[model samples]
Target: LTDLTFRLLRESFADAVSWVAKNLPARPAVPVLSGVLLTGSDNGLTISGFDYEVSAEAQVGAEIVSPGSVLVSGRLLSDITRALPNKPVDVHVEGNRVALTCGNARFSLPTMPVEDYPTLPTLPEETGLLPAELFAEAISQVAIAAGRDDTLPMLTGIRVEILGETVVLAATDRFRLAVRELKWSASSPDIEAAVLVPAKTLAEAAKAGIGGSDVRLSLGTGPGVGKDGLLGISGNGKRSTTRLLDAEFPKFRQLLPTEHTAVATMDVAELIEAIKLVALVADRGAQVRMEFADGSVRLSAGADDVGRAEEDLVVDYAGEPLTIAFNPTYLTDGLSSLRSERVSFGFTTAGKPALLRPVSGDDRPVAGLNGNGPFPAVSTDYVYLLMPVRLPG
Candidate 1:
């Protein structure tokens, strides 16, 4: 029997546990997965789940009068415990059944034998821990490029490249490559880790690693994380380990645009709004016509049922006038995240990929053009490299 309090651990443990729940694939093998495997040690209680690409672990401080381990349903138990009254929850695991009592509500959930659960990979000795938010933010940025078409397996995984002290992550479907970089403090002079971590796995790790807390990351040797397998993330007493995808991530750097024919500055929010409004009547083709001229930009959309909608904006431009058509959803997706009042749109050609970023106003040679550093060819904090759709030129 042990007493686990909710108030003390809810912030981190709840977040970490929730990440696994959402990211883990639903399997028919288990009816109601309310509990995860729990092991009580001298330090604290460790909780984990083993199914699909998602696995999570969390250390909860508890007065363990008895030392034991049990496979409690992860989803149910986490939810019940999270919603329980702020006091300490009494838990008694004597046999195959476990009883959790909080306030007046008592939950007696059936448990699976710990022996029946699959074995989680052992974490390697060498570990690299940093601000969990960095990795979490990186994954969130890159995961937008993950392929949702379901036809390609490799496109579903984000590229995890650990070179020197820098960790670069990237994901792309033939259309665009979302890349994010971070400086890992523990990546040594001797070791470099690079692998294709599954997007779902990255999503799980991102969810658990978002808060402003210390995140511990343990990486293994070679393509497959092997024993350690993939990067294991832990912070705020919660943990999540994922298996790295074994595939060669495409050379995204080579595919990025090196030169531009036109650049224009416009409002980000207004652009997103224009796209949303236009999408309403856009045909099944879902195309939005963007007409760029001397000093203004106009966006238009039309459908068979609905007539048409158009909006225009004043913009600063330095290229030939051009008309381009794009999926309104795709344009909106790229423009919504820009944290700026005014944004810049650079284009190489009418039907080629257009680059969007905040126009920092002051001209310090745009980093995208200067090949000077390791990430010599880079965009802004965010880059949405869209694949050009062939339109009537």
Candidate 2:
């Protein structure tokens, strides 16, 4: 029976999976994976989908008179339930129809056999758990490089690597490498598992699984030889299995330059907002022109149909002038993920990949990585290495 429970809360969680409509697997003669899988236990009810690797299982502020679980069309159920009246609504199974009733409203929906639903993968007992929020924050920095091409599946995934007390996430498009680190020695074990997860799945997992809490992860057991392996994540008991990409991830480490021809310090937020405003006139690729000079930087973008626009900002640098073009989304996305007031810019060539990081010592540089240490002087907790086009140097 549906009660006057956290109706709005349920709706909130439902919104998280709404994006699945675009990513959902096409319907077959059967309708298991095509529907939303709901798990009801003493812990709480969980809702999930494999399409986008986007699953949300939340605690609702309601008591259950009778505990049960079922699977229903994700799109239809969310829409119908969200439209129900605010009062307690009685829901009962009558043949193939599940009737929903409120004080003055009533509706009925056809139910599919729950037994047909896809089986949830069992996570290995020896799983690794780490701070969820930290994982999400680190991913925010690297996801920009994740490719959209499913044909080259590996580029669409984020690589999770554990070294000592640090967890590193790296993604690239063969032109540049974006890496972010988190110090998670607390959950660190003698065991290590490295896996490549699809960008779409990792994005959702990072956003909801990691953040505000810790997430559990285990390697997938399948009939594969060396190298490729599947990985699983359970966020608040909401679980999903993602296949690891098999191809060799580019040698991203060597791609990073040991020395820089120029370096500059600038405000990340201001640059992001400015680029966003001018992005309207940018081309289909969201391209932007950047001109770097001694103590000053200029940003420009335009299209044939729309007029061009340019903005300039003062920065801390007295190096040789350089100019380059790039996909504005890359720079702006990296900037939004940063919480620092100042950021560092390093370049080896005019059209080479440019690197971005929090100012040498932006005390509030997320929770993990030691920005005050020597690694930041050489590396950082969050790094954005972007590809660029020609201009001047």
Candidate 3:
């Protein structure tokens, strides 16, 4: 008769289970998919869950009374473990039943068939190493533009491009596009690679490991990662692997403009506050009209039936006076994603897509249209392209 027993601190067990269960879908298609496998070995106990597309494993420190394994409902175990009192949690497996005891709380859960669980995908060869905060910040910036629509699978995933020591993450939903570039230490500095990772999965994994100092990013051709690719991020004591989306990502480089006919710069925080105040009156499908001229920009939104709102912010404007409009929500999405104190806007035409980029302190100013008008120059490593909303004439 095989026996399994272990004891661990309540907080440690709760954290391990929570991390592994973070990516579990709300509705798992199979019973085994909903189970968290607890494997015991001389090293420690690992809690793991996989739903085909994404897999997570967290190792927790525990005193092993005996060596064995058990499978239980992921959600139920996570909930119960978190609510346990501030004491050690004792778990034991007897035949098909697993017993849990913590302080005065005691419960019994029927164990699922361990044989039914699918093998977790192996992590691909390490491609690079990134600072955890930088990785999380980049993911947040680009993932905002990923499409939530599942029908077009490509748009819902963030395209990761690995070129030399630079990694570029881009996502777009046809309406707008966000691109972010960051530097990392790659195993092969000249390696050229690209993969599409589901935005939701990548975002969650980054968040889970953000507290760690460094995250090891692995992406390459290996046993479990090939044409049907795998992307893995490991840090601290946790590791997560996600299946690459098997879709051709759009060619987004050409979508970026080579030059702009006009440019405007403004305080990012001030603009965000002004936009919030003016957007209150922006009805559904309504455009937030922005009139840029001289040294300031005026933002207005409203309808005949609904009240109107108008706010103005000082800006450094260059080029011909232009009045353009954009979806207020989309505008805020771009503005909020910026990390700098100020933002710059580059425009070629009122109807053409505009570029929103963070303004840096040392950025060189572009000559103001040869005294015709000041043409804004681009700055920053990130760009958000927003399609202009046609304003009513």
Candidate topping lDDT: 3
Q: Stretches of candidate 2 above 4 Å error?
A: 1-30, 37-70, 185-188, 210-212, 220-229, 273-287, 300-310, 360-377, 390-393
Query: Which scores greater on TM-score, model 2 or model 3?
Result: 3
Q: Which candidate is the best by TM-score?
A: 3
- Candidate 2, 110-171: lDDT as tens digits: 77677766664444442456778767767766887778776677788888876535668998
Model 2 has an lDDT value of 0.63
Consecutive 10-residue window with the lowest summed lDDT within model 3: 220-229
Better of 1 and 2 by TM-score: 1
**Cα lDDT tens digits for candidate 3, 1-393:** 567889989798999999988887688888689999998898699999999889999998899888988889999998898888989999999778899999888889998999999899988888788899888899999999999998778999999988868989999998899999989888876678788889999999887665678898888633322453788999988999998888898888888887788888889999988888888878764678899988889999987666788998888887778999999889999999988888888887888999998876836444455444434344458999999986454
- Write the candidate numbers in order of decreasing TM-score: 3, 1, 2
Clashes of each: 11, 5, 3
Q: What is candidate 1's lDDT per residue for 58-175, written digit by digit as tens?
A: 6667666667788777777668767877655667774878877766878798877677677765555545666776667667777877887767778989887767567677788777
Q: What is the lDDT, from 0 to 100, of the residue 340 in candidate 2?
A: 76
Clashes of 3: 3
Better structure of 1 and 3 per TM-score: 3
**How far off is residue 156 in model 2, in Å?**
0.5
Candidates ranked, most accurate by lDDT first: 3, 1, 2
Local error of candidate 1 at 204, Å? Answer: 2.5
* Error at 249, model 2, angstroms: 1.0
